[PDB]
Design a protein around this ligand. Structure first.
Ligand code: AMQ
Ligand code: AMQ
Lengths: 258, 258
């Protein structure tokens, strides 16, 4: 009956309201994906329950274990019926789960502490004084691991050998590292997140260079699930009606700080 | 069995080579979508023949006969196995055929002569001194006809009532009008074409402001087609390897005669 929705606490997509301890159920959370979920549910006609991914990961197939983790894993192994969050549509994921057409565009980007002498991925690839890395178990790390493009492959080789580890468990960890490393740590995360944080206090970070790639987020369901078709059409419907646009403007600019 | 590919003549997507009369088969054609077809065939392992859609339409259902025309029609009625062209993924189409994840992003945009005082659709709707319109048929006009959002509905009512008519028979006519109207005419069309023209002599037009909507072109196949899965994975793979970006640069930015 009730659709189990797996998501992740990632501002401004999903976050607990300040007064959450005084609320209940889905009302405890707020954000882009929270509004999106309510929209998808309404158009598809189902009741749902927002649940936070247990391991706090987006999703990757562990090397050796071969087991999928994160929101992808929850879908693959029967823990959730649908994933509504900033989950990147990728080849490896599409092979084990279904994705609706994209509801938002984005690209891998670089976040630096203001003043860091870096302007591009190429700049990063040429040196080591300023360490750089990305988040574990997601599409960004996989991108560098698989890229055959000169600059990116060099960066991957760099990351694997850099000490101490340049990888972080979460976006929060990555951003905190950038802010506390006095310009010696650059973080590779998606443009959506980079731009949001940039316009928020303490206004000490900034996106540099253009995006490294072009892709999108999609709503994911277990492979072959009957929910896919309806969900896919709803997303196209919301986009065509201009709702997804209003949603982004609301969560990315209607609340800016810097 | 040779795969029947339906496409449409539209620059710079598909065009007959200047010396086509000296070539044969698929070799007569050139363009972004011709190159794309080659990449997909290679990744999916199939032989194919490029055929040009008979009615020169993209894909719409007649409200009276309920018949689908264009490339979508050829797939719906089983006359072609796959459509590779600048065919936009839409709700109504997704209901009758299958679309791979998008291979190129776009949106309705404004084309102006360099120098005209217009920076957005909002600006256009608030004035009349600078006339603006769309092609007398097609997805852009249909977008405005159906739009329920304030700004666009106002633009539609203006366009429908404006005299002399602000509509043009073809894209070429629209761009010509922009170039000869000394800044008194703005043309609304797909961002992709806008960007292409902006890169060509005489370099007197420019794309301005943000797009009015966000969507993407996708490779289409009949519902339940065995080719669907592979083609979708091929697009994702081509994108992840940076091949799609290289292709756009080849046909848009490397050859930009500006
Ligand atoms: C959000 C986000 O921002 N930077 C990132 O790498 C991510 C995670 C990415 N969307 C994934 O699906 O792995
Ligand atoms: C190309 C093109 O240019 N303007 C247009 O409307 C189109 C066709 C549009 N992309 C469709 O699929 O209907």
């Amino acid at each position: 009956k009730t659709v189990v929705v797996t998501t992740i606490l990632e501002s401004p997509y999903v976050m607990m309201k300040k007064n959450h301890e005084m609320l209940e159920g889905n009302e405890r959370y707020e954000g882009y994906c929270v509004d999106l979920a309510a929209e998808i549910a309404k158009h598809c006609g189902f009741k749902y329950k927002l649940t936070i991914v247990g391991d706090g990961k987006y999703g990757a197939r562990d090397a050796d274990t071969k087991i999928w983790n994160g929101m992808v894993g929850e879908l693959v192994y029967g823990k959730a019926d649908i994933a509504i969050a900033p989950l990147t549509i990728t080849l490896v994921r599409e092979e084990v789960i279904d994705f609706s057409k994209p509801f938002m565009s984005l690209g891998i980007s670089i976040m630096i502490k203001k003043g860091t002498p870096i302007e591009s991925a190429e700049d990063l690839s040429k040196q080591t004084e300023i360490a750089y890395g990305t988040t574990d178990s997601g599409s960004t790390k996989e991108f560098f691991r698989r890229s055959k493009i000169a600059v990116f492959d060099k960066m991957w080789t760099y990351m694997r050998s850099a000490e101490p580890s340049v990888f972080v468990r979460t976006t929060a960890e990555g951003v905190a590292r950038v802010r506390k490393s006095k310009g010696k740590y650059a973080y590779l995360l998606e443009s959506t997140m980079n731009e949001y944080i940039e316009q928020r206090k303490p206004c000490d970070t900034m996106k540099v260079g253009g995006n490294l790639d072009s892709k999108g987020y999609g709503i994911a369901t277990p492979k072959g699930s009957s929910l896919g078709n309806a969900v896919n059409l709803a997303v196209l419907k919301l986009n065509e009606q201009g709702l997804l646009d209003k949603l982004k403007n609301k969560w990315w600019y209607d609340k800016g700080e810097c």
